[PDB]
């Protein structure tokens, strides 16, 4: 399948960007999506994860309170906001897809909670980059 | 317009399940002087008229090789075997040095001298200071050298020996397997069905048919018939189909006997625990054997090879399983208490597949007998089978075959297999599976409940 | 959950099988009974690529040279007959609990 | 279609007309029907040893009791006590299934509905128990009003 | 890798709430009375008998209260009304004093000496009612 | 030191009284069919105690009589079962004597109560 | 268990605990002994070691430790024939 | 322990005689026996 990205470029410290990741021929309301991050000459990291329900989102520890992940199941898109950009975020941002679709939330009767299920990867994106600089 | 959740109780659905099944053998009066290794007495009485409802327009995938009832049965066959041997007599005082020599007995009146021997040894008694000698007879498949000469039994290197209680029968009685409430059993009544994959003619039952727990290797004795053609069931869809389960349509009678006339005398070791030994021979000594009708068998073997080609299309040749012990090699079965070991080399020397296609009387199979039985594929837990007085004769049908497939070029060698005792009950349980009825379902209708 | 690998780089011969192992601190057996170990591959300047998505089973479109093994915390990846399409970066990923951490990363090379 | 599970295969419009066949085998013919379990008890009294087939009759009785009571409790929490087709006030949410009535009731079996709606029934059961509990509170203080 | 979604009512979550809003969650405890964690997706172990004893106990206690509902006029229901007038020697508290102010487990420690006397009067007025509903059907 | 206060309906109690006065104490004896005054045969005693209770509750569910003490069916009383008058049944007869009167005809009447529930067709 | 065991926070309730009259401790103590005795019962009874043990301390940069807390001891054991003895040492 | 060291006795009546101390940070015992001893198998009966 095809996974297309855009929205990457060059900004200043203390700015706001909006990445994007448009998909090709999915159901896309069944598959929860990811965001990994690869600094130059480093290994991979993990940033964020939204569900196919678009209800429960999680973030990494270092990026907490700064990012914002949303999606539009009509337009088949991912919408990664960023706020108050530091210097060490100069890397490549890839969206991704779990190798099987998580089902619905599973209601636990004893405590009355809904649970989502997360797993690995099939398709990383093209790979767009954000490089923060001064001038 | 508007839709509303409505509840239906009594919905005909099921899911694949795995539960506890119970015995339902036929009712029979309590005989005091005999019991079976099988309980068949604590089983619930069998219903007089079963019901078998035919299910229209449903398919259901079966798999005879991943069937849970096969492994569920096999742990009950062993548990009942170890249930009726704990109140029996332990033969710890017999693992000693045996002073054992030949028998001191116009030509055909004595044949099998070289199987029996005349052993003698110091046995204990009730009084702790008194010792006594006895003169029991033993086979040579029960003894190991210590290099007349002075040598011991087999199992005393590795295991403790327990004498079987002689008021207990070794007899298969047909037991059923019934599902409890809320469960059911589905039965594929579709013939020409290779065990795995979908079935189209399914039908629900509550209990199985009567299954005899017959312990046998290389041949499926006293089983059930295929109804129409020889059916061949292989392990894999790939080319590594090692185990083949052949099922026949017409039985092949095999007469088996033991023509010697043994006498059982009793030796008292300890306070109240008598050891039943082979006393003496009254009459002639002849070797045990089995007859297979010639051409009766040969007709049925040609029907096997005709159905083998539809899977393979190579040349088809049969070999005897050469390497191994006496337990993998032979046709091992149970004849009224005695454990026979028959030599099927004169049956599997054929060289078929030149094309598609004479009564030579009967086929005489030489058979040896053991009395010390490592019963399953396990060590540490041997068993002594006591002697039986008289002349024993069993007649049984041959209903199946267990074959090991062997690789270079175009040659398919099929040797007889055995030892994996689960294959003896995949052949009976191939067409059943257990389901769990879930009769409570919801659906929208558009009828709202009247609430003010 | 931390991840460590042995070694950091291989230097092998084409036609000779090799192996790369990963080590986890906590056991990765989920409550489903299935583990959460993932084997990846990044060619230089390229998108990553899944190879083995459990202990054992192989991704649809990967040749049978890559076999996986292990249970608990000890895991390996045994390449059979290393060839010219088997160089680059190999990663381990857990998905037992958040955050979804990646391993260190090996660099498989030949001897020019 | 008459016979136990004989409507498995027919569409669920016609498989729901004969629900008496299932709710009689699963209510009557389970514990009340058999008296031959206490004919095997005295045969277990004759032998002085607990056998393997005596343990399996415990586990086939305690599975038979629990399977009966965990479908009558669940019909007791709802308003559907002693009946086979009952209606509720829970509106059908189209994110459970967007499928039309003619496709459901006339081109789909009950056994094809099990493999579609089973992820959702734990959510559906919460809303039937909640609306039954809101109903009996409302018809108590209405009762006490006059 | 899991995550907590939306939350609903849970088991015993209205304990110590009040008495009038803890009666809007009666089905939540009534769902957890028969089936526990014992039911999941080789013989006579110590942990095997102790699991089987927990399954025979859970049916005996469930059938105890379910019997006692049917002896009364209240079968298959969660809130039912009787004809037994309340007696102020059992408890004298006001109507706005046990509702909206008291919780259960405070009302439980108050009338637990009087429940055996109360239970007898509910059963007695059910015999008297069912004879009268019989004797009304003779006309 | 233990005294004895007021006296209410005991367990059997009305076992010797008439069938018009014994049908007001039906709740007393229905309480004692399951509870009792109570290691592998420790369990088989309990499971039989449960399944003797559920056998009589399922049989009342086959009929229309689930969840009530006095229920009513529309099977006519055949006058050959017993031909006694209504006052010499409900005022001059106990339940232990009526049990011996129709002990022959018990399986006939149960077969008719069950049939008239399948003949609802509703 | 397919969900791991959970924990519901109960609001506005107080409750008296008592760790010295808790019966979960006495129930756990009878279970750890019960599981202990279940395992040792199929293991081998070891009555042929109730015999005499004739021995002298051990034989021998230097080892020079453990000379007074450990010694080989030779004894007549039983064989698998209950007619023969075997001369057997053990530390 | 979450906070500081908790100390628990039965009853404050000068007849307690057992004290349960629960620490907050552990004290890592490491403990060994250095010897490369062997083990032999000696038959004393039928398989035992
Ligand atoms: C039918 O059905 C359906 C379905 O159902 C489902 O399913 C089933 C199966 C079952 O299960 C059930 O149960 C379910 O439900 C239904 O539907 C539904 O409904 C409901 C209601 O009723 C709903 O709910 C809702 O929700 C929401 C959400 O919330 C969340 O979020 C928020 C935020 O939001 C966000 O924001 C952002 C910004 O910032 C955005 O972004 C944006 O976007 C755009 C586009 O759109 C663009 O892109 C731009 O650019 C951007 O910027 C987004 O979008 C949004 N989103 C959304 C979704 O909206 C917040 O605020 C909140 O709070 C929440 O949050 C959450 O929280 C939680 C807690 O904390 C969390 O969790 C956590 O996490 C962590 C980490 O972080 C850890 O992990 C832990 O563990 C956990 O726990 C999470 O995460 C979070 N998330 C987030 C994302 O954040 C809301 O909002 C809403 O609200 C509403 O209401 C209220 C009250 O009433 C009000 O006030 C408001 O206003 C509103 O109105 C609601 O609640 C859902 O959603 C739904 N679903 C669907 C699918 O639809 C129905 O209903 C039925 N029917 C009937 C008839 O009924
Ligand atoms: C109800 O809930 C269920 C889950 O509930 C949870 O689990 C249960 C057990 C219980 O515990 C609950 O309490 C839990 O909450 C939902 O179940 C989900 O079902 C879906 C399918 O229905 C399934 O998704 C599939 O997963 C596989 C991989 O996972 C399988 O295999 C592994 C390894 O064997 C195994 O571990 C997994 O468990 C899983 O096994 C399957 O399990 C289910 C259920 O347990 C069984 O029913 C199956 O039999 C079993 N299968 C096997 C073989 O064992 C994915 O690889 C797979 O995705 C690929 O295939 C689909 C085929 O449709 C492709 O989709 C198509 O893509 C086209 C793109 O061009 C597009 O045009 C088409 O439109 C689109 N088709 C549709 C219909 O939209 C898809 O794109 C993938 O194709 C791959 O694409 C790659 C990218 O290029 C290529 O590189 C690959 O080569 C290519 N491969 C192929 C073959 O083409 C599929 O998604 C979920 O696994 C399962 N959930 C979970 C958690 O396991 C259920 O849906 C819920 N709802 C209902 C109504 O029941
Ligand atoms: C495949 O299936 C066949 C068919 O059942 C089995 O063949 C039977 O095998 C059994 C076991 O050996 C045979 O039973 C024995 O029969 C002997 C002869 O019985 C005749 O005489 C008696 C009266 O003396 C008649 O009642 C009877 O009808 C026969 O005419 C008996 O002498 C044996 O009794 C001994 O054992 C029993 C039980 O242990 C004791 O109670 C006795 O005291 C005595 O010691 C025994 O009953 C049976 O006859 C065989 N049937 C046939 C038709 O041959 C195969 O064994 C089976 N094969 C396999 C591998 O399971
Ligand atoms: C248990 O003992 C048997 C037989 O005892 C051995 O063989 C006798 C001839 C004699 O030499 C005794 O002192 C021996 O202890 C073992 O079976 C034999 O194993 C040897 C090992 O090489 C082999 O050469 C023989 O062919 C075997 N004989 C048979 C009949 O199989 C057996 O292995 C011993 N088992 C264990 C667990 O020790
Ligand atoms: C097996 O077959 C042989 C020969 O077919 C049988 O031997 C015959 O036994 C009868 C018994 O009286 C004799 O009259 C015949 O003369 C024997 N024939 C030969 C050629 O010796 C033998 O009895 C058969 N055994 C069984 C158990 O059926
Ligand atoms: C096996 O050997 C024993 C002892 O050598 C034989 O037992 C003797 O048999 C004769 C038969 O006439 C008796 O008179 C003696 O009393 C026996 N006991 C002795 C000598 O102690 C036995 O016959 C031999 N053969 C077997 C069992 O077939
Ligand atoms: C073969 O064994 C049988 C037993 O099955 C012997 O027959 C018994 O002989 C004794 C005499 O010592 C009689 O008292 C019994 O009544 C006989 N029983 C039966 C069933 O016949 C027989 O003597 C033995 N020897 C042969 C046939 O040569
Ligand atoms: C035991 O039998 C006696 C018979 O005299 C019962 O006493 C009478 O019962 C009738 C029933 O209506 C009353 O009309 C009479 O007034 C009673 N007689 C007296 C002297 O009180 C007595 O009730 C029976 N026992 C029980 C427990 O009912
Ligand atoms: C009422 O009971 C009488 C019993 O006398 C029934 O009459 C007999 O029933 C038996 C069994 O069906 C038959 O064998 C007899 O032939 C019947 N007697 C006559 C004279 O025909 C009677 O059927 C019952 N029912 C009704 C409605 O009267
Ligand atoms: C403990 O005693 C045993 C005696 O059985 C010693 O083993 C052998 O003893 C003989 C005679 O004393 C020596 O000739 C051998 O060299 C010994 N060693 C063997 C056969 O390996 C043993 O050495 C003693 N000391 C220990 C175990 O430290
Ligand atoms: C509570 O205090 C009482 C003192 O009255 C303890 O009783 C004594 O406890 C000590 C050791 O705990 C024993 O040596 C004495 O024998 C006990 N006295 C008597 C008369 O038995 C009691 O043990 C304390 N409670 C607990 C749980 O330990
Ligand atoms: C058995 O037959 C079915 C249909 O005839 C087929 O799908 C399946 O592959 C077969 N399996 C084997 C092992 O022959
Ligand atoms: C054996 O059967 C296969 C399948 O029908 C067939 O293709 C093949 O030609 C057959 N072999 C020969 C030698 O004809
Ligand atoms: C098998 O057949 C061959 C050839 O017919 C023969 O030489 C051989 O003796 C036979 N085997 C046996 C055991 O009779
Ligand atoms: C089975 O299918 C046939 C063919 O569609 C149909 O005529 C028949 O009514 C079906 N029977 C049942 C019981 O569904
Ligand atoms: C579900 O059904 C509605 C009409 O009832 C339709 O508009 C919608 O597209 C359907 N959903 C999907 C995913 O096709
Ligand atoms: C706990 O008490 C406070 C006031 O005391 C109340 O507002 C709150 O609703 C109570 N919590 C619950 C769950 O009832
Ligand atoms: C019970 O309440 C009434 C209020 O009507 C009060 O008069 C009476 O004193 C109270 N009794 C006790 C024991 O508190």
Numbering used by the authors:
A (entry chain M): 2 to 52, 52A, 53 to 82, 82A, 82B, 82C, 83 to 100, 100A, ...
B (entry chain C): 32 to 136, 145 to 146, 146B, 147 to 185, 188 to 309, 312 to 323, 323A, 324 to 353, ...
C (entry chain N): 2 to 27, 27A, 27B, 27C, 27D, 27E, 28 to 108
D (entry chain D): 519 to 664
E (entry chain F): 512 to 552, 566 to 663
F (entry chain B): 512 to 549, 572 to 655
G (entry chain E): 77 to 136, 145 to 175
H (entry chain E): 266 to 309, 312 to 315
Paper text:
Here, we describe the structural characterization of an apex-targeting antibody lineage and autologous clade A viral Env from a donor in the Protocol C cohort. We previously characterized the V2-apex PCT64 bnAb lineage from an elite neutralizer in the International AIDS Vaccine Initiative (IAVI) Protocol C (PC) cohort (Landais et al., 2016, Landais et al., 2017). In this study, we combined negative stain and cryoelectron microscopy (cryo-EM) single-particle approaches with X-ray crystallographic studies of early and late autologous Env-antibody complexes to decipher molecular details of the co-evolution of HIV Env and the immune system response over the course of several years of chronic infection. Comparison of Ab-Env complexes at early and late time points reveals that, within the antibody lineage, the CDRH3 loop rigidifies, the bnAb angle of approach steepens, and surface charges are mutated to accommodate glycan changes.
From our initial screening, a full-length Env clone no. 43 (PC64M18C043) that was isolated from the 18 months post-infection sample (from here on referred to as late Env) showed the highest expression levels in HEK293F cells, as well as a native antigenic profile. This Env clone was subsequently scaled up and purified from the cell surface via PGT151 affinity capture (Blattner et al., 2014, Lee et al., 2016). From this construct, we obtained a particularly stable complex that resulted in a 3.1 Å resolution cryo-EM reconstruction of full-length late Env bound to PGT151 that enabled us to build and refine an atomic model. Like JR-FLΔCT-PGT151, only the ectodomain, excluding the membrane proximal external region (MPER), was well resolved. Thus, the presence of the cytoplasmic C-terminal tail (CT) does not appear to influence the conformational stability of the MPER and transmembrane domain (TM), at least not in the detergent micelle milieu. Similar to previous structural studies of Env, the majority of the unliganded glycans could only be resolved between one to three sugar moieties, indicative of a high degree of conformational flexibility in the glycan shield. The high-resolution reconstruction of late FL was sufficient to delineate the positions of glycans with atomic detail. The apical glycans N130, N156, and N160 are within the epitope for the autologous Fabs, with N160 acting as the main glycan contact. Of all the glycosites of the late FL, 72% were occupied by complex glycans, 26% by high mannose glycans, and only 2% of the total was unoccupied.
